[PDB]
Scaffold this active site. Structure first.
Site, mmCIF file in Angstrom:
data_model
loop_
_atom_site.group_PDB
_atom_site.id
_atom_site.type_symbol
_atom_site.label_atom_id
_atom_site.label_comp_id
_atom_site.label_asym_id
_atom_site.label_seq_id
_atom_site.Cartn_x
_atom_site.Cartn_y
_atom_site.Cartn_z
ATOM 1 N N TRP A 11 -17.555 -39.594 -11.796
ATOM 2 C CA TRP A 11 -16.742 -39.859 -12.976
ATOM 3 C C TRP A 11 -16.498 -41.372 -13.014
ATOM 4 C CZ3 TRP A 11 -14.391 -36.105 -16.397
ATOM 5 C CH2 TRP A 11 -13.739 -36.750 -17.436
ATOM 6 N N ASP A 34 -15.107 -44.804 -12.948
ATOM 7 C CA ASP A 34 -13.803 -45.389 -12.649
ATOM 8 C C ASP A 34 -13.370 -46.470 -13.623
ATOM 9 O OD1 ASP A 34 -14.288 -43.776 -10.348
ATOM 10 O OD2 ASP A 34 -13.877 -45.326 -8.905
ATOM 11 N N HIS A 64 -7.636 -30.757 -12.052
ATOM 12 C CA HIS A 64 -6.784 -31.891 -11.705
ATOM 13 C C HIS A 64 -7.638 -33.114 -11.562
ATOM 14 C CE1 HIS A 64 -7.628 -32.377 -7.154
ATOM 15 N NE2 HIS A 64 -7.571 -31.076 -7.173
#
Lengths: 278, 280
Positions: A164, A166, A212
């Site tokens: 993912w 940053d 999350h």
């Protein structure tokens, strides 16, 4: 330009209304001198709290039911694996990257790629494959087995978005791909509980996707919003309604950055979904 | 768009591709003169009519209002001519869509000509990296200034937009492609206006100041970026996606838009504009 700015004004007002006062009766407070919130200001709506010792909430936006939570602190791991076990978790989506996890300053335990023992719980994971989501973003898939003394062994599919970005925001295109992977993993495991006759399937606070990122309000809200726009039955909801429901059900920061709201506007637009109410 | 319309679009494009297939020593295609390899890939040839130089596999393309140059990654032996094209063109932006990983794989023979300083016959070049720009989903464009110096000639500076981490496996989404097309246009617009305030005669030449774009063969990712740049221009409004790919293929070779995934980016961008896929 216009409708987007107005959407932001209504959401800013709601956010301000929901702001946590000192020892606010709407928000879960740390019972027992243990640190509950990873960030002082990202708190847990008490009413929808899953457990008294986790900063995690049951969310339901229209038809879509999920649990959104913060990355568990080291001290929360045993309660965190108990939540995943009792919920009979059909898919756990972790949206924090390996670079974030590996940076010890952030204190984010690598609890799902390793085997470990947490109080009475023993877990072990196995990586089973990577699935490409678009633009080189990959989801690494793991099976998490949670075993507990005297209790049944529960396996939880984990979708880890290992890379993912940053820095940048993830496009609506990769987000929709990820929402769809999360629904299909969930559907499959849910049908396995159903064919084995778990009572779980009758109880609507169980078999929910647990999602999350780090604090459970940015990326988490981007994915949950996308999973909601994905279920046909949610036709009538505007972007204003969805973010509003998430905010009163977890906290005012759900959908934390403008970049996350723009992904939700793009997806909405592609459906002819309204941004605002009226 | 509809599976049906997409399938019909593919049929029309496959027929054109077959009409354009190179015969042995085809007069429509540029032939290698002598015993000099011209084509980096023998099946991906250069349309003679729009060719830029007789010793490069590179074409002038003009789809509607949009004028660019699409080329293959130059072979080692083509580097001096390649630098001469970039200098005479007064290149406002060079977009390189091959990733660092591809460039470093020696089997592919792709000279790292824009990130190093070097001497190629009478041309000396040097580059400086100036900054990275994020395009979306972790993809980054690394920016370089390429200074081309040649004996008795002027020193020309070419902005280079290198997509260093273009995914080797997956396709790039329409969202990142739109971000890349817009960076390329803005870099070009800026360097074009410098030539203008300096009084360059070149701004009136329609074969000059063209974006040069190349990936490895200059037919797949190149075609994806050029299609997107054409759609970023208001004067191209009347054109369907069938007209843009058809013009590109007749202006370079019929492999332009090499993969179905490349065509789908063009269809997604088209769809978001209410641009038609087909003609009629």
């Amino acid at each position: 330009p216009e409708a987007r700015a107005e959407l932001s004004s209504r959401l800013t007002t709601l956010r301000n209304t929901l702001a946590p006062a000192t020892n606010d009766p709407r928000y879960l407070q740390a019972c027992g001198g243990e640190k509950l919130n990873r960030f002082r200001d990202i708190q847990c709506r008490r009413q929808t709290a899953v457990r008294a010792d986790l900063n995690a909430n049951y969310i339901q936006v229209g038809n879509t039911r999920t649990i959104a939570c913060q990355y568990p602190l080291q001290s929360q791991l045993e309660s965190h694996f108990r939540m995943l076990a009792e919920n009979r978790t059909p898919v756990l989506a972790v949206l924090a990257s390996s670079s974030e996890i590996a940076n010890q300053r952030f204190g984010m335990p690598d609890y799902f790629r390793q085997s470990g023992t947490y109080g009475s719980i023993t877990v072990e994971s196995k990586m089973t494959q990577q699935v490409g989501l678009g633009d080189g973003i990959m989801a690494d898939m793991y099976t998490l087995t949670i075993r507990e003394a005297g209790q049944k062994t529960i396996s939880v599919p984990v979708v880890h978005v290992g890379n993912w970005p940053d820095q940048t925001a993830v496009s609506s295109e990769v987000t929709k791909a990820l929402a769809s992977l999360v629904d299909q993993t969930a559907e499959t495991k849910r049908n396995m509980y159903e064919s084995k006759g778990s009572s779980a399937v009758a109880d609507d606070s169980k078999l929910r996707p647990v999602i999350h990122c780090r604090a459970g309000v940015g990326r988490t809200a981007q994915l949950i919003g996308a999973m909601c726009m994905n279920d046909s039955r949610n036709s009538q909801l505007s972007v204003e309604d969805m973010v509003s429901q998430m905010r009163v059900q977890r906290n005012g920061i759900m959908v934390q950055k403008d970049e996350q709201l723009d992904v939700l506007i793009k997806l909405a637009e592609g459906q002819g979904r309204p941004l605002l109410n009226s």
